[PDB]
Design a protein around this ligand. Sequence first.
Ligand code: LP0
Length: 356
Amino acid sequence: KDQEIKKLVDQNFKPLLEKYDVPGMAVGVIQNNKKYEMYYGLQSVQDKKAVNSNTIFELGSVSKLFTATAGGYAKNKGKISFDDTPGKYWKELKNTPIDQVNLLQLATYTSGNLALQFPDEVQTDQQVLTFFKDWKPKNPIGEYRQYSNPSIGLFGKVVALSMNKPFDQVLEKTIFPALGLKHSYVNVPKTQMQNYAFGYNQENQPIRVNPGPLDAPAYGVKSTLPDMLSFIHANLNPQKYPTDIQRAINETHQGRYQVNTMYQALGWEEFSYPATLQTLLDSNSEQIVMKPNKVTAISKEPSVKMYHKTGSTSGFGTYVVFIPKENIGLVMLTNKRIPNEERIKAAYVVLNAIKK
Ligand SMILES: *[B@]([O])([C][N]C(=O)/C(=N\OC([C])([C])C([O])=O)C1=[C]SC([N])=N1)OP([O])([O])=O
């Protein structure tokens, strides 16, 4: 049975490399605390350098899961309340319209007036402060979900303020060590640049993510397959980890509201398990990702849950999924974007063929 995992990943993931002309891929499965690492192709086309357990990939929006974990850690240490507003920590936002939005609404994209991205012109800290000072509501606060880098970005900045550390240090000095991650970075050091994969755009030109406003909390983390399998292990089996990070992890698993079949947790998307393929595909549909959607209160609190998150930068694709009840999870890292649908479907076939 264990011998089948490589064959399943070869059957379902390997063909995507030829299909989308992806230079390199790392696919990890964790089942009953056993890790399986499958490596394909090249971390660098020009250097002919093979993807391996040292290869560092851009996580894109999977970074939001670390931001969520940092938030849960700060909350359970009493450094913040999710009922708090940003002005309590970022003084220059005190008594401004954005100061009517609480930390949970920022983390779960329900300010009612924040788009996917900051405007291109917003780059400096001053321009970012100005943007939030000038912010005014549109939809009723807490009622509409619009997936937003600025929204969880501001949440990340406030978490960092609450811990009196820059956000990069919150992750690199507190959260990553607590999760036992050896090669996870906001800023990849000189000594690890040799292990940092090139991303490849739709013209197969090498690219890396550029600095941007509140980039670190929104899409700014880089990691290896082993590290991301450790992170999934922590989400499946927190008991081996410190109480503080156990509490932080449990906080990220709590559904806050529904958009039909999708439950918004902290960073994580949550579903009733078993979930149909189309439920998981629907979670990252144009309608859900790009448009505002009126939320409902959770009506059906699922007994048995699964969680996933996609991530993209210009050069990298990420997908992470775990199912506590089956004690299984999967990580996919590519140094070229492939459609979300392909990531979700490949993972669905593999996880459904192992478990039973
Ligand atoms: B996350 O990753 C977010 N994302 C972002 O931001 C981006 N983009 O976006 C889109 C288009 C939507 C995609 O998908 O990709 C970017 C690019 S470059 C950078 N830095 N960033 O989440 P998702 O949804 O993506 O998964």
